[PDB]
Design an enzyme around this catalytic site. Structure first.
Site, PDB file in Angstrom:
ATOM      1  N   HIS A 176       0.826  -1.221   0.000  1.00 55.66           N
ATOM      2  CA  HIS A 176       0.000   0.000   0.000  1.00 55.66           C
ATOM      3  C   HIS A 176       0.841   1.242   0.000  1.00 55.66           C
ATOM      4  O   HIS A 176       0.491   2.222  -0.701  1.00 55.66           O
ATOM      5  CB  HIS A 176      -1.143   0.117   1.063  1.00 55.66           C
ATOM      6  CG  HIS A 176      -0.884  -0.481   2.409  1.00 55.66           C
ATOM      7  ND1 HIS A 176      -0.600   0.278   3.537  1.00 55.66           N
ATOM      8  CD2 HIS A 176      -1.010  -1.761   2.843  1.00 55.66           C
ATOM      9  CE1 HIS A 176      -0.545  -0.515   4.589  1.00 55.66           C
ATOM     10  NE2 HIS A 176      -0.744  -1.760   4.188  1.00 55.66           N
ATOM     11  N   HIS A 226       5.368   6.737   7.010  1.00 57.08           N
ATOM     12  CA  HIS A 226       5.107   6.399   5.620  1.00 57.08           C
ATOM     13  C   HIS A 226       4.484   7.635   4.998  1.00 57.08           C
ATOM     14  O   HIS A 226       4.161   8.586   5.724  1.00 57.08           O
ATOM     15  CB  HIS A 226       4.113   5.199   5.555  1.00 57.08           C
ATOM     16  CG  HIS A 226       2.820   5.480   6.253  1.00 57.08           C
ATOM     17  ND1 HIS A 226       2.647   5.268   7.617  1.00 57.08           N
ATOM     18  CD2 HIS A 226       1.661   6.044   5.801  1.00 57.08           C
ATOM     19  CE1 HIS A 226       1.411   5.635   7.963  1.00 57.08           C
ATOM     20  NE2 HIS A 226       0.796   6.116   6.878  1.00 57.08           N
ATOM     21  N   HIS A 268       1.439   9.108   1.897  1.00 57.29           N
ATOM     22  CA  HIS A 268       0.378   8.875   0.897  1.00 57.29           C
ATOM     23  C   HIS A 268       0.599   9.902  -0.191  1.00 57.29           C
ATOM     24  O   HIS A 268       1.015  11.040   0.120  1.00 57.29           O
ATOM     25  CB  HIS A 268      -0.981   9.144   1.529  1.00 57.29           C
ATOM     26  CG  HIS A 268      -1.227   8.291   2.758  1.00 57.29           C
ATOM     27  ND1 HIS A 268      -1.907   7.089   2.696  1.00 57.29           N
ATOM     28  CD2 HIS A 268      -0.795   8.417   4.038  1.00 57.29           C
ATOM     29  CE1 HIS A 268      -1.943   6.542   3.911  1.00 57.29           C
ATOM     30  NE2 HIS A 268      -1.243   7.309   4.730  1.00 57.29           N
ATOM     31  N   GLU A 300      -4.083  13.203   2.397  1.00 60.23           N
ATOM     32  CA  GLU A 300      -5.278  12.641   2.964  1.00 60.23           C
ATOM     33  C   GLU A 300      -6.086  13.725   3.638  1.00 60.23           C
ATOM     34  O   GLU A 300      -7.280  13.962   3.258  1.00 60.23           O
ATOM     35  CB  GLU A 300      -4.899  11.553   3.993  1.00 60.23           C
ATOM     36  CG  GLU A 300      -4.196  10.377   3.226  1.00 60.23           C
ATOM     37  CD  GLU A 300      -4.458   9.030   3.927  1.00 60.23           C
ATOM     38  OE1 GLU A 300      -4.054   8.857   5.108  1.00 60.23           O
ATOM     39  OE2 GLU A 300      -5.073   8.157   3.303  1.00 60.23           O
ATOM     40  N   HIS A 308       3.136  10.618   7.442  1.00 54.79           N
ATOM     41  CA  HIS A 308       2.536  10.221   8.702  1.00 54.79           C
ATOM     42  C   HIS A 308       3.592   9.580   9.560  1.00 54.79           C
ATOM     43  O   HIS A 308       4.144   8.503   9.173  1.00 54.79           O
ATOM     44  CB  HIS A 308       1.396   9.189   8.480  1.00 54.79           C
ATOM     45  CG  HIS A 308       0.176   9.822   7.880  1.00 54.79           C
ATOM     46  ND1 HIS A 308      -0.838   9.111   7.236  1.00 54.79           N
ATOM     47  CD2 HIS A 308      -0.187  11.139   7.825  1.00 54.79           C
ATOM     48  CE1 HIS A 308      -1.769   9.962   6.818  1.00 54.79           C
ATOM     49  NE2 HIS A 308      -1.407  11.195   7.169  1.00 54.79           N
ATOM     50  N   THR A 341      -6.206   5.630   8.779  1.00 56.12           N
ATOM     51  CA  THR A 341      -6.828   5.896   7.473  1.00 56.12           C
ATOM     52  C   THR A 341      -6.789   4.734   6.502  1.00 56.12           C
ATOM     53  O   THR A 341      -7.163   4.904   5.329  1.00 56.12           O
ATOM     54  CB  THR A 341      -6.169   7.102   6.788  1.00 56.12           C
ATOM     55  OG1 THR A 341      -4.834   6.727   6.390  1.00 56.12           O
ATOM     56  CG2 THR A 341      -6.132   8.335   7.717  1.00 56.12           C
TER      57      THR A 341
HETATM   58  C1  LIG Z   1      -3.523  -3.236  13.445  1.00 57.28           C
HETATM   59  C2  LIG Z   1      -2.975  -2.116  12.555  1.00 57.28           C
HETATM   60  C3  LIG Z   1      -2.371  -2.586  11.193  1.00 57.28           C
HETATM   61  C4  LIG Z   1      -2.525  -1.539  10.095  1.00 57.28           C
HETATM   62  N1  LIG Z   1      -1.668  -0.633  10.691  1.00 57.28           N
HETATM   63  C5  LIG Z   1      -1.283   0.502  11.130  1.00 57.28           C
HETATM   64  O1  LIG Z   1      -0.397   0.217  11.927  1.00 57.28           O
HETATM   65  C6  LIG Z   1      -1.573   1.902  10.653  1.00 57.28           C
HETATM   66  C7  LIG Z   1      -0.779   2.929  11.160  1.00 57.28           C
HETATM   67  C8  LIG Z   1      -0.992   4.242  10.719  1.00 57.28           C
HETATM   68  C9  LIG Z   1      -1.999   4.517   9.788  1.00 57.28           C
HETATM   69  S1  LIG Z   1      -2.282   6.080   9.304  1.00 57.28           S
HETATM   70  N2  LIG Z   1      -2.346   6.120   7.748  1.00 57.28           N
HETATM   71  O2  LIG Z   1      -3.572   6.516   9.757  1.00 57.28           O
HETATM   72  O3  LIG Z   1      -1.157   6.875   9.750  1.00 57.28           O
HETATM   73  C10 LIG Z   1      -2.826   3.476   9.355  1.00 57.28           C
HETATM   74  C11 LIG Z   1      -2.601   2.135   9.741  1.00 57.28           C
HETATM   75 ZN   LIG Z   2      -0.927   7.129   6.767  1.00 57.57          ZN
END
Ligand SMILES: CCCCNC(=O)c1ccc(S(N)(=O)=O)cc1
Ligand SMILES: [Zn+2]
Length: 258
Positions: free
Chosen positions: A62, A92, A94, A104, A117, A196
């Protein structure tokens, strides 16, 4: 084969496997600056990254994540709207297929070319997997990228992307200093929201910086050359890996500045 950003498995489909997609505190949101309330009781953010220990960079199909050692209180975020200490685990981005989309969060409906982020978790919960099940479990520092002059601090990330072109590739990525991705000002907006990406858990205090960083068009082009697919599979460029703005509902966005 799971969720993604395409027309068939993109954000409009997520709610079918993650019903929290239509929950009360989803992210991202549009930041309406005429409505966000200055809150002079907000403290200054404390971003303490001098002992940050980066380990690895991974293309997860992703985005790409730069991961840190979070086994100790090395790189942490404190202060601002937060209680206690949140440890940096990964960052990371987006980004878009064109410079006029990719962020975002939006500010007065304006989109930036990308958004960084920096993800941190609340040490009172002992581990990250416990922290994501709590409404105050994570703090994500969000920073907008506009296309402009090159960001010297990003170049080490852009230089390694060749080596993780496809899903599930990783590369050692040590001694990377995330301080080099920060703007001059730490003025911010803050609101309670969610991951997100699936599982979209409502566990995040968002802290979104007012001042974007500038990156060059050659730098963001390099993000756009990554692939969503694994090695061997049909090429699908990793672009437009952003979730659109979600309704604010009964939330108030606070500004740290007036
Ligand atoms: C259990 C979590 C597995 C998916 N994992 C994440 O650790 C996750 C971290 C940050 C964002 S965000 N894009 O809002 O920064 C989104 C997802
Ligand atoms: Zn993110």
């Amino acid at each position: 084969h799971h969720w993604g950003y395409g027309k068939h498995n993109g954000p409009e489909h997520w709610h079918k496997d993650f019903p929290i997609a239509k929950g009360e505190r989803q992210s991202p949101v549009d930041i309406d600056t005429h409505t966000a309330k200055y809150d002079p009781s907000l403290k200054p953010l404390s971003v303490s990254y001098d002992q940050a220990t980066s380990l690895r960079i991974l293309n997860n199909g992703h985005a790409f994540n730069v991961e840190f050692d979070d086994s100790q209180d090395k790189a942490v975020l404190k202060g601002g709207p937060l209680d206690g200490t949140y440890r940096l685990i990964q960052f990371h981005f987006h980004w878009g297929s064109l410079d006029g989309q990719g962020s975002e969060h939006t500010v007065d409906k304006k989109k930036y070319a990308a958004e960084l982020h920096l993800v941190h978790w609340n040490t009172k919960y002992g581990d990250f997997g416990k922290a994501v099940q709590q409404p105050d479990g994570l703090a994500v520092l969000g920073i907008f990228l506009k296309v402009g002059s090159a960001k010297p601090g990003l170049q080490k990330v852009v230089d390694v992307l060749d080596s993780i072109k496809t899903k599930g590739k990783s590369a050692d990525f040590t001694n990377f200093d995330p301080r080099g991705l920060l703007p001059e000002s730490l003025d911010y907006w803050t609101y309670p929201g969610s991951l997100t990406t699936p599982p979209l858990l409502e566990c995040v205090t968002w802290i979104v910086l007012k001042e974007p960083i500038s990156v060059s068009s050659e730098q963001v082009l390099k993000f756009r050359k990554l692939n969503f697919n694994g090695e061997g599979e049909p090429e699908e460029l990793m672009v437009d890996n952003w979730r659109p703005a979600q309704p604010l509902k009964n939330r108030q966005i606070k500004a740290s500045f007036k």
